[PDB]
């Protein structure tokens, strides 16, 4: 509430539409590969197992 004045966010431009086909991969470090050795066929089975 800017005292009846429009707010900080109320003065903002409308920026950037959003991809409905946004998709990522749950990215891990290589520091967990430092944990597990070798875990042949490093995969999702090695990841969630």
């Amino acid at each position: 509430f800017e005292g009846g004045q429009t707010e900080l966010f109320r003065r903002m431009p409308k920026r950037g539409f959003l991809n409905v086909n946004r998709k990522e991969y749950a990215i891990v470090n290589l520091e967990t590969l430092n944990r597990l050795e070798d875990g042949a066929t490093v995969s999702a089975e090695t990841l969630v197992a």
């Binding site: 966010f9 109320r10 003065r11 903002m12 431009p13 409308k14």
Partner: protein, 64 residues
């Protein structure tokens, strides 16, 4: 129940981890005649949010 996130406020803002928020520039939409040549050179980009202000973050822009 839950605390409702204002989705259009989320369309106003974008904050960073371990840091502040990115605020796009004012004035930059409607007329461009009287705003200067230098202001056209520089006001496409924009700076960050305040420090002592904006503490009315809480918690109207929750967890987006």
């Amino acid at each position: 129940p839950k605390q409702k996130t204002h989705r259009a406020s989320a369309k106003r803002f974008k904050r960073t981890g371990n840091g502040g928020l990115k605020r796009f520039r004012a004035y930059t939409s409607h007329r461009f005649h009287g705003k200067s040549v230098k202001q056209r050179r520089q006001l496409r980009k924009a700076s960050m949010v305040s420090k002592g202000d904006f503490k009315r973050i809480r918690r109207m822009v929750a967890t987006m």
